[PDB]
Amino acid sequence: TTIQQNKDTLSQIVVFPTGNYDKNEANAMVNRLANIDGKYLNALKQNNLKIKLLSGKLTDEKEYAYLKGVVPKGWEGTGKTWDDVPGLGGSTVALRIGFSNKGKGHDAINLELHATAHAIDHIVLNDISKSAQFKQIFAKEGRSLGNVNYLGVYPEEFFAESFAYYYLNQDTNSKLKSACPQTYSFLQNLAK
């Protein structure tokens, strides 16, 4: 099946932490990632992108220590810094196990799909969220998925969140089609 192929591709992308961690929840995260179109997963694998699952804070990892005390883009005024943030995506992907669900220190519909969408945007699609075409869609639809001072202000955030709605499950896919029809069509066409 296509889901099994996607799990095989993810086996060459996902990295588990050293030490004790919740293996069942790490498996559940992989299973949710396996719903992403295989073409994107294959491209991530070819670029040697790793999806790092973590059992502690992101900034406790040596490669993210430099973000200690840094206020993420869009998180101004929250009293929080990267120390508090459970997921990161872009040139790399790093994710705290257990923090997938919306509301666990973040507002994404799913942590791992949202972070991985940033990596797909940046690595696979050469920052398409900042293209004129997507900016035009974002101008119209970017306040229709909640969190207007974040998703509605940063097109790369609206891209990542939309991508997560499209791929998490049938209900979020349906909600995106209703709320953001142009974004939905854009994502459908990208995966063709």
Binding site: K73, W82, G90, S91
Partner: peptide
Amino acid sequence: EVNP
């Protein structure tokens, strides 16, 4: 490149 990094994004929350």
